[PDB]
Every structure is written in structure tokens, then in C-alpha cells.
Write an enzyme that holds these catalytic residues in place. Structure first.
Site, PDB file in Angstrom:
ATOM      1  CG  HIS A   5      -1.955  -1.177   1.105  1.00 37.51           C
ATOM      2  ND1 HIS A   5      -1.891  -2.281   1.932  1.00 37.51           N
ATOM      3  CD2 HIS A   5      -2.998  -1.397   0.272  1.00 37.51           C
ATOM      4  CE1 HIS A   5      -2.860  -3.123   1.622  1.00 37.51           C
ATOM      5  NE2 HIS A   5      -3.550  -2.609   0.622  1.00 37.51           N
ATOM      6  CG  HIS A  59      -1.911  -0.239  -4.341  1.00 32.09           C
ATOM      7  ND1 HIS A  59      -2.625  -1.058  -5.192  1.00 32.09           N
ATOM      8  CD2 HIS A  59      -2.808   0.249  -3.456  1.00 32.09           C
ATOM      9  CE1 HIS A  59      -3.892  -1.086  -4.824  1.00 32.09           C
ATOM     10  NE2 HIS A  59      -4.028  -0.298  -3.774  1.00 32.09           N
ATOM     11  CG  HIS A 104      -7.572   3.737  -3.310  1.00 31.25           C
ATOM     12  ND1 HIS A 104      -6.715   3.682  -4.392  1.00 31.25           N
ATOM     13  CD2 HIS A 104      -7.424   2.560  -2.652  1.00 31.25           C
ATOM     14  CE1 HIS A 104      -6.075   2.523  -4.382  1.00 31.25           C
ATOM     15  NE2 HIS A 104      -6.482   1.828  -3.334  1.00 31.25           N
ATOM     16  CG  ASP A 105      -4.902   2.149  -0.310  1.00 31.67           C
ATOM     17  OD1 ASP A 105      -5.845   2.014   0.517  1.00 31.67           O
ATOM     18  OD2 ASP A 105      -4.534   1.200  -1.059  1.00 31.67           O
ATOM     19  CG  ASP A 136      -8.336  -1.299  -4.067  1.00 33.16           C
ATOM     20  OD1 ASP A 136      -7.137  -0.961  -3.938  1.00 33.16           O
ATOM     21  OD2 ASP A 136      -9.070  -1.582  -3.102  1.00 33.16           O
ATOM     22  CD  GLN A 145      -1.788 -14.520  -3.538  1.00 28.40           C
ATOM     23  OE1 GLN A 145      -2.716 -13.902  -4.078  1.00 28.40           O
ATOM     24  NE2 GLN A 145      -0.841 -13.912  -2.832  1.00 28.40           N
TER      25      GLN A 145
HETATM   26  C1  LIG Z   1      -6.095  -2.672  -1.140  1.00 26.08           C
HETATM   27  O1  LIG Z   1      -5.707  -3.853  -0.409  1.00 26.08           O
HETATM   28  C2  LIG Z   1      -6.470  -4.043   0.775  1.00 26.08           C
HETATM   29  C3  LIG Z   1      -6.439  -5.463   1.281  1.00 26.08           C
HETATM   30  C4  LIG Z   1      -7.028  -6.439   0.274  1.00 26.08           C
HETATM   31  N1  LIG Z   1      -6.005  -7.234  -0.415  1.00 26.08           N
HETATM   32  C5  LIG Z   1      -5.348  -8.275   0.385  1.00 26.08           C
HETATM   33  C6  LIG Z   1      -5.796  -9.684   0.021  1.00 26.08           C
HETATM   34  C7  LIG Z   1      -4.961 -10.091  -1.151  1.00 26.08           C
HETATM   35  C8  LIG Z   1      -4.541 -11.342  -1.507  1.00 26.08           C
HETATM   36  C9  LIG Z   1      -4.760 -12.657  -0.824  1.00 26.08           C
HETATM   37  C10 LIG Z   1      -3.508 -12.918  -0.026  1.00 26.08           C
HETATM   38  C11 LIG Z   1      -2.772 -14.076  -0.207  1.00 26.08           C
HETATM   39  C12 LIG Z   1      -1.606 -14.301   0.504  1.00 26.08           C
HETATM   40  C13 LIG Z   1      -1.192 -13.358   1.410  1.00 26.08           C
HETATM   41 CL1  LIG Z   1       0.188 -13.693   2.418  1.00 26.08          CL
HETATM   42  C14 LIG Z   1      -1.885 -12.191   1.597  1.00 26.08           C
HETATM   43  C15 LIG Z   1      -3.045 -11.980   0.876  1.00 26.08           C
HETATM   44  N2  LIG Z   1      -3.762 -11.265  -2.636  1.00 26.08           N
HETATM   45  C16 LIG Z   1      -3.654  -9.947  -3.026  1.00 26.08           C
HETATM   46  C17 LIG Z   1      -3.298  -9.424  -4.275  1.00 26.08           C
HETATM   47  O2  LIG Z   1      -2.709 -10.330  -5.119  1.00 26.08           O
HETATM   48  C18 LIG Z   1      -2.084  -9.880  -6.235  1.00 26.08           C
HETATM   49  F1  LIG Z   1      -1.201  -8.976  -5.806  1.00 26.08           F
HETATM   50  F2  LIG Z   1      -0.976 -10.635  -6.193  1.00 26.08           F
HETATM   51  C19 LIG Z   1      -3.629  -8.116  -4.604  1.00 26.08           C
HETATM   52  C20 LIG Z   1      -4.358  -7.352  -3.707  1.00 26.08           C
HETATM   53  C21 LIG Z   1      -4.774  -7.870  -2.481  1.00 26.08           C
HETATM   54  C22 LIG Z   1      -4.395  -9.177  -2.120  1.00 26.08           C
HETATM   55  C23 LIG Z   1      -5.716  -6.987  -1.722  1.00 26.08           C
HETATM   56  O3  LIG Z   1      -6.183  -6.013  -2.291  1.00 26.08           O
HETATM   57 MG   LIG Z   2      -7.313   0.380   0.657  1.00 24.47          MG
HETATM   58 ZN   LIG Z   3      -5.795  -0.076  -2.383  1.00 17.88          ZN
END
Ligand SMILES: COCCCN1CCc2c(Cc3ccc(Cl)cc3)[nH]c3c(OC(F)F)ccc(c23)C1=O
Ligand SMILES: [Mg+2]
Ligand SMILES: [Zn+2]
EC number: 3.1.4.35
Length: 292
Positions: free
Chosen positions: A77, A81, A117-118, A217, A250
């Protein structure tokens, strides 16, 4: 002020030269200065500088303010991003043909909200401080910047254009709370399932705008596999290191959050299919690893 000088001077290459129209766009090779130029090109080719009489020096200074108020020490963040979320908004508007469906004030607000937004995010594992608490603070930061002397890119707007724009900006930033996304997406899918989705309804327009903010986002999830793998790293750094399990996490986040969103979005405008497609190709890859 050294930095505003070099940026205010530079020529802004075309949208095509910068690749900010491809849903596949990546920012890893770009300096901060180059993301600023990309950002000016976004405002310019959306007709935002023309239609609202933005003084070049103030846009430049506004962009550097926004960049300044993201934290370098946060892995995911951060300003990049924020820049990527705006690029995806841009590509969704142009490449994805969504521009036609919105007004200029909506477009001007989505771009400002995507970039803002962040603001001042400190990493998911620093939920210090003193119903969308973060998002409210993000909007406060955004407004605070839009009002700083020399940064007021909305001065060209009438008072009524201005009040309308800030309402949308606030709604757009608040929409990036995945809690609100979960609360409201059921209605969005329902109206697309039943072929009754009409943007001329105000409540439906505002709901699409919220959904589009989430689609952008989260859009790292749609990127070509080597790009998305590198972001996925950054997401993990922030979540874990506060600065084998991952592949299946993921796939869970893609299934729970992303696929429906990007599916629905493709039904509204099928030129947004690269996002849904990019999301599927990433689910495939992550699932393969999830199976060791
Ligand atoms: C604005 O963010 C606010 C929070 C929301 N959030 C978190 C959730 C998320 C995961 C799921 C995940 C898997 C493993 C771990 Cl260790 C951590 C999270 N993947 C991400 C992602 O993937 C892509 F980049 F690769 C791109 C964005 C986000 C996430 C995302 O948005
Ligand atoms: Mg956010
Ligand atoms: Zn964001």
C-alpha cells in the site's frame, strides 16, 4: 521543489508511448518522475485538463503532493499501488470502453479517488489510530491535499460541480473497503444476472462506480503472471514481515473476491475481458503451485 521543476518542464509522452492503455501495464522499470508523467497523461487524455481548466503547474504540484503522502516504507500500500490503481481506471475507461458510460465529473472523481484511495496507509499490520475507518482517513488526506494552496486542481469547477465531484470522490474512496464491496456486490450481480442493469438509475450508477473502484483497486490480481507474482511478493512482505501457504491463499482470495467482480464487469463491457482473463490465468498458475 527541485522535483516540481523537472516535472513541470518535461514533455508528456503520448498514452501509446507510455503503455497506460494496456490492462497489462507494469510500473517496475519507471522512476517516480515517470509515474508522474504517466499520471499527467491520464488526466490529459481523459480531457480532464481541458474540460476543467487545470493549470499545468498545479496538476504537477498536486500529483507530487499525493505521491509525497504515501509511505515509502510500506511494501504494497504505497504510491505505486495508487498509481497502478489509476492506470487500471484509465485502461478500463479507454481500452475497456467504459468512458462512454460516464460523465466527466464521474471520470474526474474516479481518477482522483483511484490516486488518493490509500493515502497515508501504514501497512495492514499497523492498525493503530486514536464502518470504514481507514477509508475515511484516506479521504481526509485526499481532501486536505485538494485544498492545499497551489494544489487545487478543482478550482476550474463551479461550486456545484465541485460539491458533486467531492461526493463521488468520497464514495469512490469509501467503496475500496472490501466490507462495503461484500455488502453491495450481491445487488450488482443480481441486476446483471437478470439483465436489468441500467446505468440511468442513479442508485445503479453509484453502485457501478463502487464496483469499478474495487475492480481497479484489486487489479494486480489480473496482471501477467510474472508481474502478478512480484506484487504478490509485496503483498506478502506487508502482511507477514510487517514492512507454501501463499499459493492456496491466493486461490481463495481470487475465488472469494475477484472472479465474480471481473466476470460481472465483463458483462457490462466486454472490452474489460482482459481483466477477467488475466485473473483466470493467475488462478491456474497459483493452483498449480498450491498442489506443490
Ligand atoms: C487494497 O488492499 C487491501 C487489502 C485487500 N487485499 C489483500 C488480500 C490479497 C490477496 C490474498 C492474499 C494471499 C496471501 C497473502 Cl500472504 C496475503 C493476501 N492477494 C492480493 C493481491 O494479489 C495480487 F497482488 F498478487 C492483490 C491485492 C490484495 C491481495 C488486496 O487487495
Ligand atoms: Mg485500501
Ligand atoms: Zn488499495
Amino acid at each position: 521543489t527541485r522535483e516540481l521543476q523537472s516535472l513541470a518542464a518535461a514533455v508528456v509522452p503520448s498514452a501509446q508511448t507510455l503503455k497506460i492503455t494496456d490492462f497489462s501495464f507494469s510500473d517496475f522499470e519507471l522512476s517516480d518522475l515517470e509515474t508522474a508523467l504517466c499520471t499527467i497523461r491520464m488526466f490529459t487524455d481523459l480531457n480532464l485538463v481541458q474540460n476543467f481548466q487545470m493549470k499545468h503547474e498545479v496538476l504537477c504540484r498536486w500529483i507530487l503532493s499525493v505521491k509525497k503522502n504515501y509511505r515509502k516504507n510500506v511494501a504494497y500500500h504505497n504510491w505505486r499501488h495508487a498509481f497502478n490503481t489509476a492506470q487500471c481506471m484509465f485502461a478500463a475507461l479507454k481500452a475497456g470502453k467504459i468512458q462512454n458510460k460516464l460523465t466527466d465529473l464521474e471520470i474526474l472523481a474516479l481518477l482522483i479517488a483511484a490516486l488518493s484511495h490509500d493515502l497515508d496507509h501504514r501497512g495492514v499490520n499497523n492498525s493503530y489510530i486514536q464502518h470504514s475507518i481507514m477509508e475515511h482517513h484516506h479521504f481526509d488526506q485526499c481532501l486536505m491535499i485538494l485544498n492545499s494552496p497551489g494544489n487545487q486542481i478543482l478550482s476550474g469547477l463551479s461550486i456545484e460541480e465541485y460539491k458533486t465531484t467531492l461526493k463521488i470522490i468520497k464514495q469512490a474512496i469509501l467503496a475500496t473497503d472490501l466490507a462495503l464491496y461484500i455488502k453491495r456486490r450481491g445487488e450488482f450481480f443480481e441486476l446483471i444476472r437478470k439483465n436489468q442493469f441500467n446505468l440511468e438509475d442513479p442508485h445503479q450508477k453509484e453502485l457501478f462506480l463502487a464496483m469499478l473502484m474495487t475492480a481497479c483497486d484489486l487489479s494486480a490480481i489480473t496482471k501477467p503472471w510474472p508481474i502478478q507474482q512480484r506484487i504478490a511478493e509485496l503483498v506478502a512482505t506487508e502482511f507477514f514481515d510487517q514492512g507454501n501457504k501463499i499459493p492456496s491463499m491466493q486461490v481463495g482470495f481470487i475465488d472469494a473476491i475477484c472472479l465474480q467482480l471481473y466476470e460481472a464487469l465483463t458483462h457490462v463491457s466486454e472490452d474489460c475481458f482482459p481483466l477477467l482473463d488475466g485473473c483466470r490465468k493467475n488462478r491456474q498458475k497459483w493452483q498449480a503451485l498450491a498442489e506443490q
